[PDB]
């Protein structure tokens, strides 16, 4: 009976490429690396300013694009779960060596599998120190989202200047996009991979050791 | 590339997976310094495994409680566990200074600067007839390449018996 | 500018003229009170502790008046206050201090609000003949000696009476 | 347009058979490309299955050695029993003895997940090069180790046209033959 | 390219009844010539290695610490390989692998516009630079290797099926 | 560098300039190449001069040559009663070794401080005379090189040829005195000195 928000969300003349019966979301342009138009719930078309979680909207007038926030959140979910699925399997001995720290706190006779390493080290205190170290990094890197939301920064999403071996230093814009797609494609799978390991070990059937089935 | 030192006669330049173009010229300059440091470490590691594995040890005492003889009775990878922790702190502390010094040169080797040269004693190998230095840099890397295979065979033979057919009934393994 | 005692602080401008001037007023008491009132309070506090240090360290060194009253006997410098309020010796000195301070209440009020031209701490008491026509740079050299020995005795008495009731020992702490 | 597609030849007189042309004559060109790809792909599996059956109906298991007592085609017994699975303990000598249909049940399930992953990698490469990158040749999955497809070029040459018809027809022969050979393993019907 | 390459002789000019030279590209034929020559050089070493191990001549004196050379000279050469120690066959399979790894990674591969595999160690290759003399010499390597390919298949068809050749299968070594 | 080739050609006309390690083209303390090439010349001359005196000093102190008179306040003669001259250095005293080492250490000091240094305008090996340089307050009668004056009057070409046969007699005595001390710690080290050398078997490279 008023004008529907459906028309503000969809393109209405183009279909989504991944889901061909749905109209294309308005923010998905194909310019982002892993973009195949997959947004069947239209979460990029949500008109909220999701940078309000970091700095509230009543602090000052600002607004981040919803697709910029989702890609910054997707890239952080990609890069965390790549290290996390690797670190679960490396400390479980999936790659041959049961890789542990030199301390006896982290030894296999104290922590037999990586399934028990969370609760055993919240109690000891190694996870409380990681929460400080990650929280210090997330405070210095998370404040750039306010600089983007105020329009003062031209920084791309998930685009710190962290290229110490400089793989993308002289590369063209086309092969930079291919490398960003390989980060996204391997990150999307490692997110689902970490969903596999953390759930199959948590069943009542068990198998806290590799291969977790 | 082939104008670089490490390309030699049988396979030169050797890059079937084309890893040199996977980054920039600063990525290849990192790869060359990492191959050279892996070679220099494994050349001392292969020689350190064969000298200590032969029974050749220094005379006397390593610490006030640990002798050099008591370490030479063990296999070499097990002899590191019985080095005193004050001794490992002296080794790693000196390596820490050597890695901080060779990184803090005025030009980085990733930006075309020099590769890690000798810290102590700080011998200058600058004007050492670059035609000879070219041939000796090919022989440093080739002896580094072989000793990286050699020390990985030494860890594999000490843990998985029969993995190296020349070190099956070798008593040091 | 740039107070001498505190070189990281600006100079308080109301101290200019007075003789103990080291530029030391970080709390800016001179911006609230008149400096004739503050100087009169400093010399009076200092003249008391000059007498109070010499009156503390002589009594507990054994010096007594002669002939000593029998109610004065068996007292150190700590115990001599509470024992002689009962005897009335403290009320005799408080009487004659209140007589002098009632006249000096008139002279302080006349100094601040009636413009008598009286220097703070001046009472005309110089019977032994100092400042014999001396230069005012030589008189101010003597006024600095009264205040510096006065300021020293205020911290000197404060130690000799705190360390006295902390230990109740012999002279170099009591 | 199904009667002017590629795989028709003189065995039916350059005429698509009528029960098969009745399915694809009122259909899109993507319907022809789907069924042509699935005919070649079924012919590829059936081509390596007739040889995998002949390896299984004989005893030419690993290790291969043309000398006597080496499990070759003439003398199918060996002396080494190369131990396909170490945790299970089964060798290639055991699987060569049982049956054609029982040979599959002796392969461990962890060995099938190495096969189905590699066959799963290959089928998504085969999908990308044929359908996503829209190839005009059915069955062209970009796999050519010895470089036949760089012939003239390209695909519009008689050598690569006749090789495409040779592949479909030998895949057509092998599709009946592995259906005729494993039928008699189940029920004797060699009519 | 099949006209411009050795292998063409006088009994059969360019023997290709199935036209497999022009079936693929230049690279496919260059793979075929590199596979005929590699099958030639294996089978020439195979025909020689069967005859001098069936003639009984052998090295002195012990192959391993447990296995003598004379123990393998008594049995047939196809059965002598089963009695070579597993550490010795691993030494053979490593140098064969290291030669195959080098010849396929020496620059400008034979499937491109490059040379066929040469001697890995020591690298000299003994080749005549005269193209009228060299072309006959590599035309001699091929058909000697072609005959040795048929010969070693006759040696394994006489050691597996008794019979199959008239001038063999009466000898206790073939 | 240009002079170093001209020196080594007169030492050997077959082997003109021999440098496998190419040590002659390096610096040490960042001076320049021409200043450290005087350091290398001075260190070679000092190594050969010490080893020349060590070789004559070996064969004197290996045989029985204990000369009167013993200079001590109680007795304790020169300890040739072992004999075996690497053992003989140990049996001096502990406090007698600092008197020998610090006296050489003045001559090491005076060759550095006085008239002209080898890492400059050179002439390495030239010991400065004690009569000049005004640093020593005694003064002393004799000099280290020419105490009796033998032999001033020799021309420059007579003395330029002297260092070239000092370098070659110095290079051989470096090999000479080490061939003795190698057989003091490992037999069969030198082949022609078997049985002569009595195997000191301690540590020759440590004073105390």
């Amino acid at each position: 009976m008023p004008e529907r928000l459906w028309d503000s969300m969809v393109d209405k003349t183009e279909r989504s490429k991944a889901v061909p019966f749905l109209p294309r979301a308005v923010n998905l342009d194909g310019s982002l690396p892993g973009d195949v138009g997959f947004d069947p719930f239209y979460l990029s078309s949500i008109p909220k300013d999701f940078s309000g979680f970091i700095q509230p909207p009543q602090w000052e007038e600002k607004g981040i694009p919803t697709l910029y926030w989702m890609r910054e959140a997707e890239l952080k979910h990609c890069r965390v779960a790549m290290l996390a699925w690797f670190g679960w399997l490396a400390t479980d001995g999936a790659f041959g060596v049961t890789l542990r720290f030199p301390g006896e706190i982290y030894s296999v006779e104290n922590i037999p599998t990586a399934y028990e390493a969370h609760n055993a080290l919240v109690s000891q205190g190694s996870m409380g120190f990681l929460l400080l170290a990650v929280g210090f990094i997330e405070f210095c890197t998370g404040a750039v989202l306010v600089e983007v939301a105020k329009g003062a920064s031209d920084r791309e999403a998930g685009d710190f200047k962290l290229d110490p071996l400089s793989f993308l230093k002289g590369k063209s814009e086309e092969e930079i996009k291919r490398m960003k797609t390989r980060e996204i494609a391997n990150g999307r799978l490692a997110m689902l991979a970490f969903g596999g390991v953390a759930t199959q070990t948590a069943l009542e059937g068990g198998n806290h050791a590799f291969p977790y089935f | 590339l082939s104008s670089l030192p490490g390309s030699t006669a049988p396979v030169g330049p050797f890059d079937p997976l084309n890893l040199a173009d996977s980054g920039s010229e600063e990525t290849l300059a990192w790869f060359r310094a990492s191959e050279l440091k892996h070679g220099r470490v494994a050349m001392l590691a292969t020689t350190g495994y064969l000298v200590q594995g032969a029974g050749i040890h220094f005379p006397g005492m390593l610490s006030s409680d640990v002798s050099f003889e008591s370490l030479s009775a063990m296999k070499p990878l097990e002899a590191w566990d019985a080095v005193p922790d004050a001794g490992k702190a002296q080794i790693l502390g000196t390596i820490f200074i050597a890695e901080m010094i060779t990184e803090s040169k005025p030009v980085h080797y990733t930006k075309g600067g020099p590769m890690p040269t000798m810290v102590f004693p700080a011998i200058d190998f600058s004007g050492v007839d670059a035609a000879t230095l070219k041939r000796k840099q090919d022989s440093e890397l080739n002896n580094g390449r072989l000793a990286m295979i050699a020390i990985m065979s030494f860890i594999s033979a000490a843990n998985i018996p029969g993995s190296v057919p020349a070190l099956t009934n070798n008593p040091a393994f | 500018k740039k107070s001498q005692a505190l070189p990281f602080l600006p100079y308080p401008e109301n101290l200019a003229g007075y003789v103990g001037d080291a530029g030391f007023d970080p709390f800016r008491f001179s911006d609230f009170a008149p400096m004739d009132f503050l100087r009169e309070a400093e010399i009076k506090h200092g003249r008391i502790c000059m007498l109070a240090w010499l009156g503390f360290v002589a009594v507990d060194l054994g010096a007594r008046i002669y002939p000593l009253p029998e109610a004065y006997e068996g007292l150190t410098a700590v115990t001599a206050h509470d024992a002689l309020v009962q005897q009335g010796a403290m009320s005799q000195i408080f009487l004659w201090c209140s007589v002098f301070e009632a006249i000096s209440t008139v002279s302080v009020i006349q100094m601040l609000y009636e413009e008598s031209g009286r220097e703070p701490g001046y009472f005309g008491f110089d019977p032994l003949g100092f400042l014999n026509g001396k230069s005012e740079a030589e008189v101010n050299e003597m006024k600095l000696k009264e205040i510096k020995n006065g300021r020293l005795a205020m911290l000197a008495f404060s130690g000799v009476v705190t360390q006295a009731v902390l230990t109740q020992g012999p002279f170099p702490y009591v | 347009s199904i009667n002017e597609a590629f795989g028709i030849s003189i065995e039916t007189g350059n005429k698509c058979p009528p029960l098969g042309a009745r399915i694809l004559e009122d259909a899109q060109p993507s319907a022809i490309k789907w069924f042509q790809n699935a005919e070649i792909k079924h012919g590829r599996i059936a081509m390596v299955a007739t040889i995998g059956y002949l390896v299984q109906k004989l005893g030419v298991h690993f290790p291969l050695y043309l000398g006597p007592s080496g499990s070759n085609c003439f003398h199918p017994e060996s002396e080494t029993a190369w131990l396909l699975s170490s945790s299970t303990g089964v060798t290639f000598s055991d699987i060569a003895k049982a049956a054609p249909l029982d040979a599959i049940q002796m392969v461990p399930v962890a060995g099938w997940m190495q096969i189905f992953f590699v066959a799963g990698w290959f089928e998504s490469v085969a999908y990308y090069r044929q359908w996503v990158k829209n190839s005009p040749i059915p069955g062209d999955y970009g796999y050519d180790p010895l470089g036949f497809t760089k012939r003239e070029g390209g695909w519009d040459s008689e050598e690569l046209t006749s090789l495409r018809l040779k592949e479909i027809k030998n895949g057509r022969l092998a599709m009946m033959t592995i259906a005729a050979w494993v039928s008699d393993e189940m029920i004797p019907g060699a009519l | 390219k099949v006209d411009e390459m050795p292998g063409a002789t006088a009994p059969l000019g360019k023997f290709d009844p199935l036209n497999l030279a022009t079936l693929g590209s230049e690279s496919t034929l260059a793979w075929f010539r590199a596979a005929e020559l590699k099958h030639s050089r294996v089978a020439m070493l195979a025909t020689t290695g069967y005859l001098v191990q069936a003639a009984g001549i052998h090295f002195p004196g012990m192959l391993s610490s447990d296995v003598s050379f004379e123990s393998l000279s008594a049995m047939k050469p196809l059965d002598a390989w089963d009695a070579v120690p597993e550490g010795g066959k691993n030494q053979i399979y490593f140098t064969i692998f290291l030669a195959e790894f080098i010849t396929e990674c020496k620059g400008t591969h034979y499937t491109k516009g490059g040379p066929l595999p040469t001697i890995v160690f020591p690298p000299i290759d003994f080749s005549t630079v005269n193209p009228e003399q060299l072309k006959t010499r590599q035309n001699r390597e091929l058909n000697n290797g072609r005959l040795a390919m048929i010969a070693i298949m006759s040696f394994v068809a006489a050691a597996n099926i008794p019979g199959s050749v008239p001038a063999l299968a009466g000898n206790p070594m073939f | 560098k240009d002079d170093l080739i001209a020196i080594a050609e007169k030492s050997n006309p077959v082997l003109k300039y021999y440098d496998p390690l190419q040590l002659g083209s390096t610096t040490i303390w960042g001076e320049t190449n021409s200043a450290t090439i005087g350091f290398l010349r001075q260190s070679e001359i000092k190594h050969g001069r010490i080893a020349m005196a060590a070789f004559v000093g070996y064969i004197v102190q290996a045989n029985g040559i204990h000369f009167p008179w013993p200079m001590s306040f109680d007795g304790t003669p020169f300890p040739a009663d072992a004999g075996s001259p690497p053992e003989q250095w140990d049996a001096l005293s502990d406090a007698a070794k600092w008197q020998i080492i610090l006296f050489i250490g003045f001559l090491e000091w005076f060759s550095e401080a006085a008239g002209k240094h080898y890492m400059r305008g050179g002439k390495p090996g030239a010991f400065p005379n004690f009569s000049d340089s005004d640093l020593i307050p005694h003064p002393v009668p004799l000099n280290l090189y020419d105490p009796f004056g033998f032999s001033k009057g020799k021309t420059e070409a007579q003395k330029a040829d002297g260092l070239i046969k000092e370098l070659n007699n110095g290079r051989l005595a470096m090999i000479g005195i080490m061939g003795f001390l190698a057989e003091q710690k490992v037999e069969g080290s030198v082949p022609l000195l078997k049985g002569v050398v009595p195997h000191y078997d301690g540590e020759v490279m440590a004073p105390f």
């Binding site: 720290f101 030199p102 301390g103 006896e104 405070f139 210095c140 890197t141 404040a143 750039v144 600089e147 003062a152 920064s153 920084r155 685009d159 710190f160 200047k161 | 922790d85 490992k88 702190a89 | 500018k1 740039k2 505190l6 070189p7 990281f8 602080l9 600006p10 970080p26 709390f27 | - | - | -």
Partner: protein, 188 residues
């Protein structure tokens, strides 16, 4: 213009490299505070005081943990300096109370010098004129290196003094023997 320490971020506007340890490291933008008696002058004086307090705390712990307490303080004998405070307070509490009131007179004067030095312009933050040897009188490039060396050693000593507090209050051992038991625990 981008910050040096965080090159993905823009440079904070009030940080222009004029101070000593300035590499533009202010991701939260705390130098833009100008409200509750707090600005860049107050935060710089707070950093410089936190630098100098923590610098004296590290060498103050390491003096007693190596050489022992001063003469007159021999009843401490504890390598945990958090524990050795309570034995001097148990024995001679007057000197710690004399030091606390002398700090109180210094700090209340320092709080006036900070606020009067801020409304004026005649005092740099952390400047007290304590250069009795006279390092600032010459070699202005060498004096700026001394200004940077104070900030660099004080920022390092802030983590060290905070660590010696926290790992002294939780292990009750002492900093140097916490270091020795960390070496033998995590050795490989």
């Amino acid at each position: 213009e981008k910050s040096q320490s965080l090159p993905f971020m823009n440079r904070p506007p009030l940080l222009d490299g004029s101070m000593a340890g300035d590499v533009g490291f202010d991701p939260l933008g705390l130098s833009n505070i100008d409200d509750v008696g707090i600005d860049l002058y107050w935060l710089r004086e707070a950093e410089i005081k936190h630098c100098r307090v923590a610098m004296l705390a590290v060498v103050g712990i390491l003096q007693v943990e190596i050489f022992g307490p001063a003469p007159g303080c021999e009843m401490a004998t504890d390598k945990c300096q958090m524990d050795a405070f309570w034995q001097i307070w148990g024995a001679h509490p007057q000197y710690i109370a004399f030091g606390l009131i002398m700090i109180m007179m210094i700090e209340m004067i320092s709080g006036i010098a900070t606020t009067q030095g801020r409304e004026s312009g005649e005092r740099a933050p952390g400047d007290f004129g304590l250069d009795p040897l006279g390092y600032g009188k010459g070699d202005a490039a060498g004096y700026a290196r001394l200004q940077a060396q104070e900030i660099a050693n004080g920022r390092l000593a802030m983590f060290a003094a905070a660590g010696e507090i926290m790992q002294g209050c939780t292990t009750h051992q002492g900093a140097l023997e916490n270091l020795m038991t960390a070496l033998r625990d995590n050795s490989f």
